[PDB]
């Protein structure tokens, strides 16, 4: 039976060096550029000798994820103020993804990453609502609202940065250039919800940081409303 | 760069050595079939041309870049969703229908979970029509546009995360031969070592008390979706007191 990288003890070179060097490549070149042969060259080592520490590309990615999650700066305990605690975790996750853009898209597996940094972060996040009388699956559903918002926002933010390096058209410029088509769509009268969105939305005109915070505040109100009903 | 939705499409044309007339639609449809069977990376201009019995360069007359092709493919398959013109007066039932149609679509075309790496939205006609339906489900409540979009954000965040993870398991298992249920079996001993450490009590509680993972995929999706709809409902109430 193939053994989890987390159950697979590691014996000049080390697993951590290999992982950190891989991360440094992916940060600027993407995860596909962080091949073993590339990471080997970065460490002045022979490629075959890397496999002794990290048996596969798949395992390298999983190690890379857990390694970076270790960079977040969370207190030991979430404390009683769940809003502040989730805001703190939200801001840290956003900053982490923007430092490591590949996090938004590198993971195409189903299985979760059960390395020590991810488990430690999960304690903090799951613990934020431990002071309400929730069943586990109620808890996990509310935390899914939180993760859903943060990851969707930042995945899109990192999509725009990626897209703009290809096209040199960023979000603001994209909205400017799409205006004549948007008007054509509104004037057709076929998309009245869309027309309402365009006429009335505020979010796209704020900077990214206040747009993130303003969505977070609404997200947290949505969790608070559910808490009112579940644990009254 | 003119967007693909504004890029005027030339007349259908048959190259002298080809049996079939070439059009944008026929190229996108042939691309979708390739992506379904072999993934989006395999659907190079050449491969898609081979499926059509056409020369590679003649495709570029109809679709100028791979990215436009992908945007076209995304909009094409979204046309497959089966939604009525208007959502109707039951918002839970309407978002339930859209959730189940999106999940089935992503299961038919699993590259939808991963192939879109851009920031810009797809404003093709199939996407805009589905967006009207989805946005329309809460349009009758007294909601500011950005409260509406935050609530629809909850809906999409749930459906996409679930199905992205579902399709991930399927892809992962084609490589490893271990699906989710088997992965849970094989990970038992390690999970028990983590619990035994005493360093992860929330994790221990989760492993002890979670029900969802033990359900079959349809029941798990439904049961999460009901909980998501309960949260949207608590928000709808609280947004318009008393
Ligand atoms: C995320 C995203 O899609 O973000 C979009 C951004 C890139 O682009 C934003 C965008 C684009 C263009 C404009 C605007 C945008 O905000 C402006 O607001 C704008 O509307 C503009 C304008 O071009 C205007 O200038 C103009 O040129 C023409 C018109 C007719 C109106 C204006 O005159 C007035 C206003 O200036 C809107 C925003 O749309 C939304 O927020 C859409 C949200 C839709 C949620 C869909 C969920 C559906 C779920 C599902 O199917 O499961
Ligand atoms: C999505 C996912 O991660 O899905 C996981 C699935 C693949 O795997 C599920 C999983 C795995 C293993 C087992 C189980 C699982 O459910 C079982 O429930 C299990 O717990 C099992 C067992 O192996 C057991 O058999 C066993 O071998 C060992 C122990 C200690 C207990 C059992 O004896 C009893 C029980 O049968 C857990 C589930 O965890 C969750 O559902 C976790 C939700 C995590 C949310 C974290 C939010 C973090 C956010 C953030 O940091 O921003
Ligand atoms: Ca508030
Ligand atoms: Cl990447
Ligand atoms: Cl490699
Ligand atoms: Cl490998
Ligand atoms: Cl941008
Ligand atoms: Cl800002
Ligand atoms: Cl793919
Ligand atoms: Cl599975
Ligand atoms: Cl089922």
Q: Atom of ligand 1 at shortest distance to CA of B149?
A: 45
Which method resolved this structure? X-ray
The structure tokens listed for A26 are 């992916």
Select from B120, B186, B238 the Cβ nearest to the Cβ of A163.
Answer: B120
Q: Atom of ligand 2 at shortest distance to CA of B212?
A: 41
- Asked if B137 and B95 count as a contact pair (C-beta separation under 8 A), the reply is yes
Half-sphere exposure of A158 toward its Cβ, with a 13 Å CA cutoff? 24
Assess whether the C-beta atom of A179 lies below 6 angstroms from ligand 1.
Answer: yes
Instruction: Give residues preceding each break in chain B, C–N over 2.5 A.
Output: none
The structure tokens listed for A21 are 């060097």
The annotation status of A16 as a binding-site residue, yes or no, is: no
Subunit contact B238:A219, Cβ cutoff 8 A: no
Subunit contact A148:B146, Cβ cutoff 8 A: no
What φ, ψ does residue B13 adopt, rounded to 5°? -145, 140
**Which of B103, B62, B176, B134 is CA-nearest to residue A1?**
B176
**Min Cα–Cα distance to chain B from A44, Å:** 31
Subunit contact A108:B203, Cβ cutoff 8 A: no
Task: Round to whole Å and give the CA distance between A95 and A154.
Answer: 9
Task: Round to whole Å and give the CA distance between A118 and A68.
Answer: 9
Task: Round to whole Å and give the CA distance between A41 and A43.
Answer: 5
Domains annotated on chain B, with CATH: 1-77 (1.10.10.60), 78-242 (1.10.357.10)
What φ, ψ does residue B20 adopt, rounded to 5°? -120, 150
Binding residue ranges of B for Ca(2+): 230
Q: Tell me the structure's resolution in angstroms, rounded to a single decimal.
A: 2.3
Task: Round to whole Å and give the CA distance between A119 and A7.
Answer: 15
Assess whether the C-beta atom of A197 lies below 6 angstroms from ligand 1.
Answer: yes
Is the CA virtual torsion B78, B80, B86, B92 positive or negative?
negative
């Amino acid at each position: 039976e193939p053994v989890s990288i987390w159950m697979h003890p590691e014996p000049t070179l080390s697993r951590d060096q290999i992982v950190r060097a891989a991360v440094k490549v992916a940060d600027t070149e993407g995860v596909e550029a962080a091949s073993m042969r590339r990471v080997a060259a970065e460490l002045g080592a022979g490629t075959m000798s890397l496999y002794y520490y990290v048996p596969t590309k798949e395992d390298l990615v999983e190690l890379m994820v857990d390694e970076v999650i270790g960079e977040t700066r969370l207190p030991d305990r979430p404390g009683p103020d769940w809003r502040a605690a989730l805001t703190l975790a939200a801001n840290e996750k956003r900053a982490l993804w923007l430092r490591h853009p590949w996090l938004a898209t590198a993971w195409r597996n189903g299985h979760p990453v059960w390395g020590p940094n991810s488990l430690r972060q999960q304690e903090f996040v799951l613990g934020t609502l431990g002071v309400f009388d929730l069943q586990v699956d109620e808890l996990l559903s509310l935390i899914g609202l939180y993760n859903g918002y943060v990851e969707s926002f930042v995945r899109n933010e990192v999509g725009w940065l990626e897209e703009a390096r290809r096209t040199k058209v960023d979000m603001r410029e994209w909205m400017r250039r799409s205006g004549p088509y948007a008007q054509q769509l509104v004037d057709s009268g076929e998309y009245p919800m869309f027309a309402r969105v365009l006429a009335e939305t505020v979010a796209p005109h704020m900077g990214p940081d206040q747009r993130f915070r303003s969505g977070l505040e609404r997200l947290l109100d949505s969790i608070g409303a559910s808490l009112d009903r579940l644990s009254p």
